[PDB]
Design a protein around this ligand. Sequence first.
Ligand code: HEM
Length: 153
Amino acid sequence: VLSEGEWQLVLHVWAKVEADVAGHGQDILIRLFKSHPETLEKFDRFKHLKTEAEMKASEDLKKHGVTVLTALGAILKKKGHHEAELKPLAQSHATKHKIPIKYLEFISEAIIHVLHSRHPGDFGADAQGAMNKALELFRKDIAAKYKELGYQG
Ligand code: HEM
């Protein structure tokens, strides 16, 4: 479990992300797609995008980035008490979108990379540690729902 001091580090930097949800969302998805090209293939919506400039130009991609970060923000602000928010998400990603747990690991790495680019002074080691712990908790709780439904994998 995160301590109260660790949750404060997470939510302090998240308040900055919320100044520019769309810019953040875009950078994160693009990092994910470039670092792990196999993740782009999950999105019939975005499959057609081949270069980073094309990705950067796509309004639809920027719109989905907002969706992802708004859902994640609502989970983080529940500070671990996220059962009602997490269950729908784990059900669609396991059974409808077919997203392996590993790809949730990849997008966590992307989020940490982008927070680090954009918010150095608010994202030193102690905040990066707290953010990694929060994202592991998210993954751990999702993985348990996957297992229940027969998708641990
Ligand atoms: C931080 C983790 C993530 C969050 C908060 C998140 C959130 C969402 C939300 C809220 C939706 C729309 C509602 C729903 O279908 O559940 C969605 C759809 C989707 N997500 Fe995720 N997602 C995450 C990670 C991923 C990753 C890593 C992949 C793919 C590698 C993925 C693939 C999809 C797909 C394919 C859709 C449907 C897109 C469309 O055709 O409209 N998601 N996600």
